[PDB]
Design an enzyme around this catalytic site. Structure first.
Site, short mmCIF file in Angstrom:
data_model
loop_
_atom_site.label_atom_id
_atom_site.label_comp_id
_atom_site.label_asym_id
_atom_site.label_seq_id
_atom_site.Cartn_x
_atom_site.Cartn_y
_atom_site.Cartn_z
CE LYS A 63 19.48 -3.65 27.52
NZ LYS A 63 20.71 -3.50 28.32
CD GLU B 91 22.13 -3.21 21.43
OE1 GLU B 91 23.12 -3.72 21.99
OE2 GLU B 91 21.59 -2.15 21.83
NE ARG B 92 28.56 -3.97 23.16
CZ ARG B 92 27.64 -3.81 24.10
NH1 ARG B 92 26.43 -4.34 23.98
NH2 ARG B 92 27.91 -3.05 25.16
N1 LIG Z 1 23.37 -14.83 33.91
C1 LIG Z 1 24.58 -14.24 33.99
N2 LIG Z 1 25.57 -14.86 34.67
C2 LIG Z 1 26.77 -14.27 34.75
N3 LIG Z 1 27.16 -13.10 34.24
C3 LIG Z 1 26.16 -12.50 33.57
C4 LIG Z 1 24.87 -12.99 33.41
N4 LIG Z 1 24.11 -12.10 32.67
C5 LIG Z 1 24.94 -11.12 32.41
N5 LIG Z 1 26.20 -11.29 32.92
C6 LIG Z 1 27.35 -10.40 32.80
O1 LIG Z 1 26.93 -9.15 32.28
C7 LIG Z 1 27.66 -8.86 31.07
C8 LIG Z 1 26.79 -8.07 30.13
O2 LIG Z 1 25.65 -8.86 29.73
P1 LIG Z 1 24.73 -8.43 28.52
O3 LIG Z 1 25.57 -8.30 27.31
O4 LIG Z 1 23.58 -9.46 28.42
O5 LIG Z 1 24.09 -7.01 28.96
P2 LIG Z 1 23.06 -5.97 28.35
O6 LIG Z 1 22.28 -5.34 29.53
O7 LIG Z 1 22.19 -6.65 27.36
O8 LIG Z 1 24.07 -4.87 27.74
P3 LIG Z 1 24.15 -3.79 26.54
O9 LIG Z 1 23.15 -2.69 26.94
O10 LIG Z 1 25.57 -3.22 26.62
O11 LIG Z 1 23.89 -4.45 25.21
C9 LIG Z 1 28.06 -10.24 30.56
O12 LIG Z 1 29.15 -10.17 29.64
C10 LIG Z 1 28.43 -10.94 31.86
O13 LIG Z 1 29.70 -10.55 32.34
MG LIG Z 2 23.20 -6.19 25.53
#
Ligand SMILES: Nc1ncnc2c1ncn2[C@@H]1O[C@H](COP(=O)(O)OP(=O)(O)OP(=O)(O)O)[C@@H](O)[C@H]1O
Ligand SMILES: [Mg+2]
Ligand SMILES: Nc1ncnc2c1ncn2[C@@H]1O[C@H](COP(=O)(O)OP(=O)(O)OP(=O)(O)O)[C@@H](O)[C@H]1O
Ligand SMILES: Nc1ncnc2c1ncn2[C@@H]1O[C@H](COP(=O)(O)OP(=O)(O)O)[C@@H](O)[C@H]1O
Ligand SMILES: [Mg+2]
Ligand SMILES: [Mg+2]
Lengths: 173, 458, 513, 52, 52, 460, 85
Positions: free
Chosen positions: B154, B180-181
């Site tokens: 996300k 968030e973080r």
């Molecule tokens: N476009 C991308 N290309 C490569 N790796 C990706 C990509 N998007 C996400 N990732 C991988 O997923 C990990 C987590 O991404 P992100 O922090 O955006 O997740 P999130 O769903 O927003 O998580 P949270 O709920 O923990 O805040 C990244 O650190 C990376 O390893």
């Molecule tokens: Mg995130």
């Protein structure tokens, strides 16, 4: 608030006071039982975890005036159920029951001025006609009333004020 | 004037003289040791008792402390004085710079604009991401929601949207960090300062370390700033770091507020609490807010009440799937669940609409075949079903794309793709123009030319 | 323009002349607590349940819990300004809304105050929001059509005037599109429309009203709104205000079509109210009487016999039967019909239309599942031509889906099974239809005649759509008198079959797809 | 049309400044039930022009 | 567009009604409080106790 | 004189305080003026001192704390006997057909004890319905109880209409129809159906519709039972039709939470089995007279696990299960042969001919239900030729159980069919053996007798 | 805050003479009737599983011995029982 749990005791006390023709004494007695309840140290004791009978005997110790074996036993009953803090509301419902039984009503009258006292004779006669009770007046002068007078009896109100009439017409947008 | 009479977690009850009881959402103030604590009034109980939520740590509070009644709600600085600065839920500066040169302060509790004021718009807003503006394109002044579980991308997707939109866009922007973080807030702050774009961005941060009241109110603080910029007549971008934390902070306090649990233990007021927040994020005849929101999905359960309630409030919804992400296809968008109000032949035109529906149909048919394939294997399929599978797999690979913020993760340069290239590429794949290339040719290539160049070296 | 404002200034002067100075008498209480839109009031010995209670300002509350020593009430508006110790007066009134013909083309809130900004209402008085439905002896059987304009619905799942038809499905499956197309198609049928919006975001309402305004439908429609911002007491009442407005037409010999959008959000607002009033939760945390809520809402939609209309109108209208048709909408979470609210609403209504995601993603739009969808009233709702043709369609198509499943790995296909499977695919292709493109009776009848007499049988499948388009264009230019005959009469005879046969033969020979 | 009605708007405000005084006196006399020949019209005109 | 302008006309009219009424009663409160008379107050009482 | 006062109104439940020496008995009726309209309350509980908790037989709207309540020292009493015939009545036994006063001679309390163990009878005389699947798979007996189970939209109402048409017109005796929780439209249509077919003179109708408050629905079924019991105690043989037993239990669930009971199972009241048994044990045929009853039973989401249908299963004699799995194929009557059953299906009643035919059909359909799973993935070519023949003949039997119904003429656009038991038995024997191995499957679908399935095959 | 068998005439009895233990432990009065359960005031010598005799030659089983009352379940028809029996 304690009203709902206080009602049964108020009825029982009034009924007993009617049988033994002691209503006035009971009123002056409940006043004292309610007043000791308001004291700081006693209030701290009431919030404590004393077993009912020990609390009851300490309270009865402070409530010396109480008629032994009638009011003190009422304290024992309320102490079994921990209703002693409701005593200010066990009183005033006793007074309400008394006023109903004596067919008497306090009624209140609020105006922009001290009413003419002939007006009060007419108002008291009118209230003794509206309600089939003797009506005690304790009218008041209030700055908020622009002119006219408010009549309040129980929870019924008859607004004769200019303020209320204005904010009733201003509603007609 | 007031006295504290109970302290239960984040909730504090205060008694006032019955002629002076504070209004709902009034701010109260109490000295807690060597610091000042604000309390916000939530409920009026009987007898002059009032129930409040602490905007800070409630530990160390005694009963019997004297409480001061401030005559107004929580009010925060608004306007250009906030630009380029980090602020707290209470509108205090949190960066080490001096005081905020406010000229005006606004109460964070406000009414939504009236039905008469709302404005329609169909201006398609382009993004660098193939799957998003193919499957779920969105307009200037609309709402976008990124739905996903933990760790599926996300934040990375939102950062790409920031990079592309909020830098080809010229107006102001507001970023609201909600539960968030903190590390991610600091990283964002710096890379804004290194790029010298910080002076266009107001940042409000209510991250997870904060006690529940802060996480509850910080979203309203951010909306209040965005509304100030909208009512000035500008076109504004609002980014919300995780809207779910607002509902969760409601859940944490709801039981202490004495409210019976509902559904999965949520507060009974969940829909109203979400709606009054969401209805204020709206473009108006005077000015336009474009919004991108991350929406965490607990336990990946898209049928949970919080995601389910959030779905109705958004114009474009992009759903991120853990099952796709574990294949390593990024961005992990599910095109059979992602959808937009803007995927309509009148606004997009016929070629885009037909391409999107063709992709959707082929991928749906692939879902229908996978249960046969799991038991029997592919060899039993018909020769047209094998072609459907062979094209669906290439479509799934071609939805992948390298991101600039994913340059650090992947190690390969990011790509920006024009919409025309996306439509042309997927139309070519579905028509079979590329039936002779291998699947690996399509993975993580920006455009179809790059697919053929990758195919030459396999 | 504004000289007429001087004239209405004279109107304001005459307000004073009409006003009345007499002092009334009223019963009084005090607010003892305020929380989340719920207030507790001490006093009000003469408060009645369901009564409107009047607050400081121009705000009201509904008395719901008449407990001993306190009344619990819900505020119909912004509650945060209320405070403990405010006086409150009990009226004698139940809740009423403005009602009448002037409402058409207006957007009003659940209290009936206009929000479109097109000035004040014109209306024909006020009607109670809560009211009982006509009894058994006062109704008449549903035997008239209300046309959806959708091939799938009008053929397979006919809706009659006075029916309650549930539209049910998951999110983003076309639930609202179907209902507003049903409204749009009434632009010339004589049926008045009411659209009730519960819990939607206001910009979505603005967009739907804009679509109603791009087409000719808005002048025939009342829009009742309770947005997601408004209180849970303004929600949960909006369906009943809409029902009162529909009943005004129902009880004067006119037809009304009312679309309750997201009855489920009415249930959610009611759950909020019930839990904030500390009423015991039931299954899935809803109160037990939610069934009574929806059932008494939906049993108002009815067709009344002429005698009831004459009695209500006191002889002004004679010989005319009035009808109110309801189309509630329910959202399922994952097709799970076993949830409490969907089970209740499925129990109450006269049928349901299932829209589902697999068909929608496959491109079958409208995504009507022929098997689990049903209309209890039946062909009694259809015109004779549609009745005659459409009877075979829906059951044939359901058994087609079963046969395809059984066939999926049979290699040899017997000619009867091959005929069924080919015909089922071509009918499945035929019922797809674009949004905001409603089809008249003659067009639907012609296309179904093409299907049921096998003129499609040889036609290759992707060209079926262009076949339908070309056939409609051909018939509109060359054979319009028959289209007028069919649309007006809805009749069907041997000469009608012969003329349709001649038209199909002539088209299929002379024209190209 | 917006410009047109704005011009007429300021004209109408000038006209209604007088009529609102009739509201003041008629409302006072109806509210006070009986009639009253009050003297201090200065208050009437002060409100009459000041807020308009 | 033309029907839109005739809706806008009514929207303009209603707002002026609202303004004049509110400001008129605002003046009337001043006028009536300044014009209180003890005989009129007594006549209000004599009216209401006659109907009560 | 009125001697009690309303002290709470929460929803449909009203609490009234009487003097401590004149407290109403349980299930006593009470009377109060709700403005102009008179309202009746039924006492459920005695609690505290002098206070009683009651259900309103009407809308609570407009009730106030303080209203005087009259104590009627009897439970709800309803008119009974011949006066009820041809009339429509509400739960309180009041006419709602505008035809005027009922003109009764006798009134009975709706609450009464069931017949004692010594009074019961076992006269299982077989009864023919004219419906293939019912007469073969689940034969009726006079004086028994029949349940039509099914979720929403599966055919309970039209099945009951077909049964009414066939037996109730032929019965030559009185009938009672209890519209418990029914749609108002359907009650109107049934009333006009009975009037136009001119049989209304032999039937009495009691209607509590969906829109009515929980008390009306809760007690309308007992009103209907009381009328049926009046005709039974005269010594007549009567038919009792119940629109939906489930909605009685659902009204109980509605009121149960407000009556202060803690909940059980899936939201249901703790008293569910007690309430069900107390209603069901009155519907029995004694030595004086017989009551034959057909009951429709709503099955929530077709989950036959749910406590209400699972509980009612024990009280019936024949149970017909209508399945949406079959209904999805459009093959009405949609009766599931592998789930429907009857007490009468044993050789000592049905005879060996009928018993053997029914058991054969059941075995064939069970075997086919197993083979279908193999077919769905491995293909029918993978089967034994014996299993292929069994699949063929079973898939024929499945369609032959379908029958076009008179009452469904509008839905099917085709005329309905009636079949005798003898012809039904012969037809199923004919499919179980080779006589019709050569006809297609579609030649059986909604045909009628086996003797005309060949005709549809020739047409097909 | 809610009532637990706090009813007016019992309270008046105790006010007159608190030591109502003077009356026999063998007997009591019904104070509530609902759904086949009765609450009985008195029966100080009641014990778990004991048979309590009711008017009409009926019985109830004492199942809850509570600090102020006995909860008993009626072994037969109950609808005619009334408080004060
Ligand atoms: N476009 C991308 N290309 C490569 N790796 C990706 C990509 N998007 C996400 N990732 C991988 O997923 C990990 C987590 O991404 P992100 O922090 O955006 O997740 P999130 O769903 O927003 O998580 P949270 O709920 O923990 O805040 C990244 O650190 C990376 O390893
Ligand atoms: Mg995130
Ligand atoms: N017949 C149709 N053909 C093509 N697209 C359609 C059709 N009907 C609806 N749609 C599209 O489907 C999408 C969702 O439609 P709609 O808003 O009516 O769904 P819904 O089930 O009411 O959604 P929600 O749960 O958000 O209220 C829209 O993009 C709309 O244009
Ligand atoms: N024997 C039948 N012939 C034709 N249609 C039937 C038959 N049985 C059921 N149906 C279909 O099922 C629909 C609903 O059945 P109904 O019994 O009214 O539902 P429910 O069981 O919920 O009361 C009917 O309107 C009709 O479309
Ligand atoms: Mg919708
Ligand atoms: Mg049925």
């Amino acid at each position: 608030e304690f009203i709902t749990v206080a009602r049964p005791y108020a009825k029982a006390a009034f009924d007993f006071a009617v049988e033994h023709q002691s209503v006035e004494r009971w009123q002056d007695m409940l006043a004292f039982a309610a007043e000791v309840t308001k004291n700081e140290q006693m209030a701290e004791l009431l919030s404590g975890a004393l077993a009912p009978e020990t609390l009851a005997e300490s309270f009865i110790a402070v409530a010396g005036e109480q008629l032994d074996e009638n009011g003190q036993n009422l304290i024992r009953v309320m102490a079994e159920n921990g209703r002693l803090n409701a005593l200010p509301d066990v009183l005033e419902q006793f007074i309400h029951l008394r006023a109903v039984s004596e067919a008497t009503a306090e009624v209140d009258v609020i105006s922009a001025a001290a009413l003419s006292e002939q007006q009060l004779a007419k108002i008291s006669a009118a209230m003794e006609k509206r309600l089939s009770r003797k009506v005690k007046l304790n009218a008041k002068i209030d700055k908020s009333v622009m002119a006219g007078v408010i009549i309040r009896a129980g929870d019924m109100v008859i607004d004769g004020s200019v303020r209320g009439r204005l904010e009733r017409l201003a509603d007609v947008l | 004037t007031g006295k504290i009479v109970q302290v239960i977690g984040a909730v504090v009850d205060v008694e006032f003289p019955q002629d002076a009881v504070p209004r709902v959402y009034d701010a109260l103030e109490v000295q807690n040791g060597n610091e000042r604590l604000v309390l916000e009034v939530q409920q009026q109980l009987g007898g002059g008792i009032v129930r409040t939520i602490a905007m800070g740590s409630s530990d160390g509070l005694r009963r019997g402390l004297d409480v001061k009644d401030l005559e107004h709600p929580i009010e925060v600085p608004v306007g250009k004085a906030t630009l380029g600065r980090i602020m707290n839920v209470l509108g205090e500066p949190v960066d080490m710079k001096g005081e905020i040169g406010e000229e005006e302060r606004w109460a964070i509790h406000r009414a939504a604009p009236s039905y008469e004021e709302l404005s329609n718009s169909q201006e398609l807003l382009e993004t660098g991401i193939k799957v998003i503006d193919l499957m779920a394109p969105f307009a200037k002044g609309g709402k976008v929601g990124l739905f996903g579980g933990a760790g599926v991308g996300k934040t990375v997707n939102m950062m790409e949207l920031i990079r592309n939109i909020a830098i080809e866009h010229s107006g102001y922007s507001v970023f609201a960090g909600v539960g968030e973080r903190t590390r991610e807030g600091n990283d964002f702050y710096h890379e804004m300062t290194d790029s010298n774009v910080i002076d266009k961005v107001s940042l409000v941060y209510g991250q997870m370390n904060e006690p529940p009241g802060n996480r509850l109110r910080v979203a309203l603080t951010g909306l209040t700033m965005a509304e100030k910029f909208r009512d000035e007549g500008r076109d504004v971008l609002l980014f919300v770091d995780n809207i779910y934390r607002y509902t969760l902070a409601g859940t944490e306090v709801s039981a202490l507020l004495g409210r019976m649990p509902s559904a999965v233990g949520y507060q009974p007021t969940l829909a109203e609490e979400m709606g009054v927040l969401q209805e204020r994020i709206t473009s108006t005849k005077t000015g336009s807010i474009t919004s991108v929101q991350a929406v965490y999905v607990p336990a990946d359960d898209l049928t949970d009440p919080s995601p389910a309630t959030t779905f109705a409030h958004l114009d474009a919804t992009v759903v991120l799937s853990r099952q796709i992400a574990s294949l390593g296809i990024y961005p992990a968008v599910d095109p059979l669940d992602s959808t937009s109000r803007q995927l309509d032949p009148l606004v997009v035109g016929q070629e885009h609409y037909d391409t999107a529906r063709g992709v959707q149909s082929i991928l749906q048919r692939y879902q229908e075949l996978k249960d046969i394939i799991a038991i029997l294997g592919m060899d039993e399929l018909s020769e047209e079903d094998k072609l459907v599978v062979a094209r669906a797999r290439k479509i799934q690979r071609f939805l992948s794309q390298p991101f600039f913020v994913a340059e650090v993760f992947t190690g390969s340069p990011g790509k920006y793709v024009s919409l025309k290239d996306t439509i042309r590429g997927f139309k070519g794949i579905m028509e079979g123009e590329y039936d002779h290339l291998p699947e690996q040719a399509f993975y993580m290539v920006g455009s179809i030319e790059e697919a053929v160049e990758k195919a030459k070296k396999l | 323009m504004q000289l007429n404002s001087t004239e209405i200034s004279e109107l304001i002067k005459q307000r004073i002349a009409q006003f009345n100075v007499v002092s009334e008498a009223h019963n009084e209480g005090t607010i003892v607590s305020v929380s989340d839109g719920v207030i507790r009031i001490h006093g009000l010995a003469d408060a009645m349940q369901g009564e409107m209670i009047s607050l400081p300002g121009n705000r009201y509350a509904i008395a719901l819990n008449l407990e001993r020593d306190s009344v619990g009430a819900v505020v119909m508006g912004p509650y945060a300004d209320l405070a403990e110790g405010m006086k409150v007066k009990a009226t004698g009134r139940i809740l009423e809304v403005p009602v009448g013909r002037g409402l058409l083309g207006r957007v009003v809130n659940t209290l009936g105050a206009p929000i479109d900004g097109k000035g004040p209402l014109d209306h024909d008085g006020f009607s109670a929001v809560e009211a009982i439905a006509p009894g058994v002896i006062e109704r008449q059987s549903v035997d008239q059509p209300v046309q959806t304009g959708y091939k799938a619905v009008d053929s397979m799942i006919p809706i009659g005037r006075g029916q309650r038809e549930l539209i049910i499905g998951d999110r983003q499956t076309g639930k609202t599109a179907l209902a507003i197309d049903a409204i749009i198609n009434q632009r010339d049928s004589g049926i008045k429309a009411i659209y009730v919006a519960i819990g939607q975001k206001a910009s979505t309402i603005s967009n739907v009203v804009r679509k109603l305004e791009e087409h000719g439908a808005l002048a025939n429609t009342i829009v009742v709104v309770a947005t997601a911002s408004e209180s849970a007491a303004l929600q949960y009442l909006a369906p009943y205000a809409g029902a009162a407005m529909g009943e005004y037409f129902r009880d004067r010999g006119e037809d009304a079509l009312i679309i309750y959008d997201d009855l489920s959000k009415q249930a959610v607002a009611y759950r909020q109210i019930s839990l904030l009033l500390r009423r015991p939760p039931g299954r899935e945390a809803f109160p037990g009487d939610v069934f009574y809520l929806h059932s008494r809402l939906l049993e108002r939609a009815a067709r009344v016999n002429a005698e009831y209309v004459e009695a209500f109108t006191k002889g002004e209208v004679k010989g005319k039967t009035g009808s109110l048709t309801a189309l509630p909408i329910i959202e399922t979470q994952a097709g799970d019909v076993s949830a409490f609210v969907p089970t209740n609403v499925i129990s109450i209504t006269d049928g349901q239309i299932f829209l589902e995601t697999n068909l929608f993603n496959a491109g079958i739009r409208p995504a009507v599942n022929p098997g689990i969808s049903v209309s209890r009233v039946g062909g009694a709702a259809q015109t004779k031509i549609m009745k005659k043709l459409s009877g075979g369609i829906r059951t044939a198509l359901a058994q087609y889906r079963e046969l395809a499943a059984f066939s999926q790995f049979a290699s040899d296909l017997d000619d009867a099974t091959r005929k069924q499977l080919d015909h089922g695919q071509k009918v499945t292709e035929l019922l797809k239809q674009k949004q905001y493109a409603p089809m008249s009776v003659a067009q639907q009848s012609l296309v179904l005649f093409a299907a049921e007499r096998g003129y499609l049988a040889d036609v290759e499948l992707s060209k079926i759509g262009s076949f339908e388009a070309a056939l409609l264009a051909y018939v509109d230019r060359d054979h319009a008198p028959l289209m007028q005959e069919i649309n007006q009469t809805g009749g069907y005879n041997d000469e009608i079959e012969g003329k349709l046969k001649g038209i199909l033969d002539s088209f299929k020979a002379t024209q190209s797809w | 049309a917006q410009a047109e009605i704005e011009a007429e708007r300021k004209r109408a405000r000038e006209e209604l400044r007088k009529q609102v005084a009739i509201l003041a006196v008629a409302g006072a006399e109806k509210i006070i039930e009986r009639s009253v020949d009050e003297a201090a019209n200065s208050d009437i005109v002060d409100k009459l022009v000041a807020e308009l």
